[PDB]
Design a protein around this ligand. Structure first.
Ligand SMILES: *[C@@H]1O[C@H](CO)[C@@H](O[C@@H]2O[C@H](CO)[C@@H](O)[C@H](O)[C@H]2NC(C)=O)[C@H](O)[C@H]1NC(C)=O
Ligand SMILES: CCCCC/C=C\C/C=C\CCCCCCCC(=O)O
Lengths: 49, 49
């Protein structure tokens, strides 16, 4: 990402505590994944806290 | 019956208690609401499955 070019760049940002960092994981089943936000894995993507 | 897991004092790592459940229906939402998950790592399955 530092040394390259991409045709588009979509950034989703929100205020999120690091104590709930496991609820944003890939296969998580918490309240965040079921009702708040589901990450899309169809393009190369990163998740940064 | 998740009462032995949620009633007494928890044991230590060498003296771990084991519960095996067959033929029953459990409320996963209540158990996930009781605890705050710090980290998890799964093998050949994901918690949403
Ligand atoms: C699993 O447990 C939760 C409680 O943690 C149950 O949710 C409650 O359901 C009753 C009955 O509808 C409501 O009056 C409460 O307000 C609910 N509480 C919460 C915190 O949601 C839930 O019904 C249980 N699951 C099943 C299938 O019975
Ligand atoms: C923490 C309570 C553990 C209770 C164990 C008993 C039954 C659980 C059965 C399957 C566990 C699936 C949830 C795994 C953790 C999800 C992490 C999260 O929520 O992001």
């Amino acid at each position: 990402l530092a040394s390259g070019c991409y045709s588009s760049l979509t950034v989703d940002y929100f205020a999120y505590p690091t104590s709930l960092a496991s609820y944003l994981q890939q296969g998580s089943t918490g309240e965040i994944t079921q009702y708040n936000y589901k990450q899309d894995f169809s393009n190369p993507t990163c998740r940064i806290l | 019956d998740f009462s032995p897991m949620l009633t007494g004092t928890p044991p230590q790592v060498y003296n771990f208690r084991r519960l095996v459940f067959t033929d029953c229906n459990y409320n996963l939402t209540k158990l996930l609401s009781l605890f705050q998950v710090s980290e998890f790592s799964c093998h050949q399955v994901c918690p949403d499955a």
